[PDB]
Amino acid sequence: SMEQVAMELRLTELTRLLRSVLDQLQDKDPARIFAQPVSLKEVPDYLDHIKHPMDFATMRKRLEAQGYKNLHEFEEDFDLIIDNCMKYNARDTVFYRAAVRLRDQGGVVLRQARREVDSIG
Questions:
Q1: For position 102, which CATH number holds?
Q2: Where is the signal peptide?
C-alpha cells in the first residue's frame, strides 16, 4: 500500500538521522573503549554481572537493519553501554571514567536529536 511505503520512508529517514547521531556519539569515545562487545574469552564471568551487554558495533548492526523504530529505543541501547560499564568497573578505572565522559558529552548530542526527531516528525 502506499501508506506502508510512506511509513517505510519515515523509518529510512529516522535511520539516516540515527546514523549521524551514532557517529557523533562514537567520536566522543576516542579510546574505542565502547567500540566492540566485551569479549567473553577475555572476561569470562561477564554475563554473570551484565545481563544485557551492548556496544557501538552491536548498535550499528541494529541500525543498518532499520531495527530502531524510534529515538527511545536507540537511547536505551546507548544508556546500556554506559550503565553496564559503570556497574562492572569501579570509579578509579579508565573504563568507568570513559563512560562518564561519554554520557556527559553524548547528552548534548541527544538533546538536539530529540528536538530534530520531534520537529521533522
A1: 1.20.920.10
A2: none
Three-state DSSP class for residue 46: helix
- Cα separation of 116 and 17, whole Å? 9
Task: Indicate the resolution in Å.
Answer: 1.3
| 22 closest CA partner among 69, 61, 49 | 61
Q: For residue 56, what are the domain limits?
A: 1-121
Kindly tell me the sign of the dihedral angle through the C-alpha atoms of 88, 90, 91, 94. Answer: negative
Q: How many domains does the chain have?
A: 1
Residues 30 and 86 sit within 8 Å (Cβ to Cβ): no
Q: Which of 11, 48, 50, 34 is nearest to 105 (CA)?
A: 34
**Three cell numbers, residue 54:** 551492548
Task: Name the method of structure determination.
Answer: X-ray
Are 53 and 37 within 8 A, CB to CB?
yes
Nearest to 71 by CA among 3, 107, 118, 28: 118
